[PDB]
Design a protein around this ligand. Sequence first.
Ligand SMILES: Nc1ncnc2c1ncn2[C@@H]1O[C@H](COP(=O)(O)OP(=O)(O)OP(=O)(O)OP(=O)(O)OP(=O)(O)OC[C@H]2O[C@@H](n3cnc4c(N)ncnc43)[C@H](O)[C@@H]2O)[C@@H](O)[C@H]1O
Ligand SMILES: Nc1ncnc2c1ncn2[C@@H]1O[C@H](COP(=O)(O)OP(=O)(O)OP(=O)(O)OP(=O)(O)OP(=O)(O)OC[C@H]2O[C@@H](n3cnc4c(N)ncnc43)[C@H](O)[C@@H]2O)[C@@H](O)[C@H]1O
Lengths: 220, 220
Amino acid sequence: ADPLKVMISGAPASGKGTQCELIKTKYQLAHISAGDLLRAEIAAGSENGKRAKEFMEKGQLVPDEIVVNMVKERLRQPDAQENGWLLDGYPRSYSQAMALETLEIRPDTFILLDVPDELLVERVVGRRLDPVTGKIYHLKYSPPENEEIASRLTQRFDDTEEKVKLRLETYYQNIESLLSTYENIIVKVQGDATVDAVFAKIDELLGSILEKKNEMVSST
Amino acid sequence: ADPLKVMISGAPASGKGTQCELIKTKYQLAHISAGDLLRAEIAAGSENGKRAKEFMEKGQLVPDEIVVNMVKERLRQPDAQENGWLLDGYPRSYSQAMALETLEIRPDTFILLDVPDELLVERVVGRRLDPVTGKIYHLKYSPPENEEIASRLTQRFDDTEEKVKLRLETYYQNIESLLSTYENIIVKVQGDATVDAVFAKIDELLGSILEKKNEMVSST
Ligand SMILES: Nc1ncnc2c1ncn2[C@@H]1O[C@H](COP(=O)(O)OP(=O)(O)OP(=O)(O)OP(=O)(O)OP(=O)(O)OC[C@H]2O[C@@H](n3cnc4c(N)ncnc43)[C@H](O)[C@@H]2O)[C@@H](O)[C@H]1O
Ligand SMILES: Nc1ncnc2c1ncn2[C@@H]1O[C@H](COP(=O)(O)OP(=O)(O)OP(=O)(O)OP(=O)(O)OP(=O)(O)OC[C@H]2O[C@@H](n3cnc4c(N)ncnc43)[C@H](O)[C@@H]2O)[C@@H](O)[C@H]1O
């Protein structure tokens, strides 16, 4: 509808979660995230959680019945319809993408983070997470702000160096169908650069899209 | 009582979980484990779990009301009283140790794993865990048996290189009171050696203790 609606995706450890924080904090959008929702169910320890976890341990995609409608109902909440939605890690397969088209849910732009596979490994092996806040960190690039935060940092069960090669396969194998799907409003953004350097680009993009929509609104 | 009852402890990543598997499988004892029980409650996602986790994230000791009786009731089960019990990671403080003495619960021997702090770090940074089985692994020493097991290995949220220094403090600071407590039947076992090399020692120890107890049984 008229509120801004974005959709982001990319290979694992490219900067999806990191960028979304910046976008969210400024634009005030409702940040949805297929990855986080999955982990939340696991955290709660439900049957869906202990089911989903299995696929995530082998680097597999969690089956549609869990994901598709879990996302569905999050979009039904008011904030997403009034302020705007920001998808993250969805869709990830033809069927998933198609599910949304049948409900007339199409974004304004599709941002893909392009990162060379050679980089990824070291990005993930140093990634940390502060549970009390939710802020992403990295021991070298973007380290903790020398606070007690350093003592409360943790890591995901699936950030094993060798897991990466596996999660890469599932990735590019499926994105071929995605690009095909009416998502051709794809804006490829180079990820091999400063966290600030990348954001600036995504900001400028969203900024102009606001002008476009607003121009028609001001039909004089 | 007459069934064998052991109690093991040591600094983090010394080999407590690893050895217990060998002991358990051979001697047929009921293996209790304060660490595992805590993680199980978190896995289940209860109020106790989300409470306990906090302390475990900063490398703190979980408060007595959660631990003390959680262990209490596990010892009440039949198998522990009929076959024998094998404590692991308990007690860890004066109060905890004392709780057991008030119920006439005393072990046969107290095995302490002596490992030089200089080693520990690399032991923990390469530790993996197969969820489907519960077998401990390490990427270099005792690697996975070249099976699909390699694809389903995970890691704990608290195996951060820098966390180690913290968990070391809490450790030796409290063991001073433990040694003091009537636990002087301490058998120090050098941990800087092959997994088989260490086990052999623990086996021979338990083996003789069986002879001792059995001798009196055969009062001729
Ligand atoms: N739709 C769906 N269908 C089915 N199953 C689904 C599903 N969605 C999820 N799942 C499943 O759930 C599992 C987990 O998925 P998910 O948790 O979504 O993981 P992922 O997609 O693999 O991605 P990450 O979250 O690891 O990476 P990121 O790109 O967001 O990186 P970040 O910004 O943190 O950054 C990573 C690191 O790089 C850093 N960093 C960021 N930008 C830069 C930069 N420019 N330079 C240097 N460092 C940087 C950070 O500090 C950090 O250290 C999957 O395995 C799958 O099973
Ligand atoms: N009573 C209590 N009161 C309050 N709070 C409590 C509590 N009990 C627990 N908690 C809390 O819960 C948290 C977690 O505690 P807990 O989970 O109990 O952890 P821990 O005591 O720090 O010990 P680990 O399980 O890490 O080590 P381990 O010595 O068993 O090592 P392993 O044999 O796997 O081996 C480690 C690695 O070394 C390997 N390895 C084994 N032997 C050798 C060898 N000889 N040579 C080479 N590699 C070896 C393995 O392959 C593996 O890679 C604590 O932080 C605390 O908050």
